[PDB]
A paper describes a structure:
[name] ([name]) is a multifunctional protein playing key roles in the regulation of gene expression and RNA metabolism. [name] contains two globular RNA recognition motifs (RRM1 and RRM2) for the specific binding with mRNA precursor, followed by an unstructured low complexity (LC) C-terminal domain. [name] LC consists of a cluster of RGG repeats with interspersed aromatic residues and a nuclear localization sequence (termed PY-NLS).
In this work, we determine the atomic structure of amyloid fibril formed by [name] LC domain by cryo-electron microscopy ([name]). Recombinant [name] LC (residues 186–320) was incubated at 16 °C for 2 days to form amyloid fibrils. The density map showed two protofilaments intertwining along an approximate twofold screw axis to form a left-handed helix with a width of ~7 nm and a half pitch of ~45 nm. The helical twist and rise between neighboring [name] LC subunits are 179.05° and 2.37 Å, respectively. Based on the high-resolution [name] density map, we were able to unambiguously build an atomic structure model for [name] LC fibril. The structure reveals that the fibril core is mainly formed and stabilized by PY-NLS. The serpentine fold of [name] fibril core remarkably contains a single but long β-strand composed of residues 260–273. β-Strands of the same protofilament form a parallel β-sheet with a kink at 263FG264. In the steric zipper, the opposing polar side chains of N265, N267, Q269, and S271 are tightly interdigitated to each other via van der Waals forces to form a shape complimentary dry interface, which is reminiscent of the first atomic structure of steric zipper formed by segment GNNQQNY of yeast prion Sup35.
Residue numbers in the entry:
A (entry chain E), B (entry chain D), C (entry chain F), D (entry chain A), E (entry chain B), F (entry chain C): 251 to 295
The structure:
Amino acid sequence: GSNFGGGGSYNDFGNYNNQSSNFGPMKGGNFGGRSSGPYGGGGQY
Amino acid sequence: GSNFGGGGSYNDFGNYNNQSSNFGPMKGGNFGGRSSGPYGGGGQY
Amino acid sequence: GSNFGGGGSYNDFGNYNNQSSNFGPMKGGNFGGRSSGPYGGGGQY
Amino acid sequence: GSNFGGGGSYNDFGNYNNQSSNFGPMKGGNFGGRSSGPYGGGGQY
Amino acid sequence: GSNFGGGGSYNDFGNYNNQSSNFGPMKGGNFGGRSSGPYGGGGQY
Amino acid sequence: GSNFGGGGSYNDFGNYNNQSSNFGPMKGGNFGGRSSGPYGGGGQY
């Protein structure tokens, strides 16, 4: 009779995948991670 | 008689995939991750 | 009769993956990690 | 004047994605990965 | 004048993703990884 | 004039991702890793 996150629970558990494979000179950017903030995610800025 | 996230639960659990493969000079950007904020996601800015 | 994060729990447990493979001169950036802050994520700035 | 995998190169770099989301009792199987061998891919056997 | 894997190179660099999200009793299997061998991939056997 | 794995090189560098998120009783299996051998990949056997 268990209660797995019932009621008013905010259950957020997804799978987020980011993959970039490359053969050659790589100067750009590959951006992943959750980044839950304003202007989040490391970049150039 | 279990309750898997019943009631008023906000159950959000999807699979989000981002893939970029490339042969050659890569200078652009591949953008993944959840990025749940204003101007979220690392970029150039 | 256990209660796994029921009630008003904020249960956030996803899988976030960032992968970048590359053959050659790599000068750009690959950005992962959670980065839960303003301008979060190490970059160039 | 670069040569990105020219000549007799076997250049194989695709993006293969497998996603299965489900709400409820999950007893079956979701099968991904490359599995480049005879009877490859973990299963029941 | 660089040679990124030219000639008779076997250049194999793809992105293979396997994702399975589930709400509830999970008894089955989610199978990923490369598994480059006979009967490869962990299963039940 | 660099030679990044040219000639008869076997260049194998992909990104293989396996993700399984689950809310509830988890008794099954999630199978990842490369597992480059016969009957490879930890399972039940």
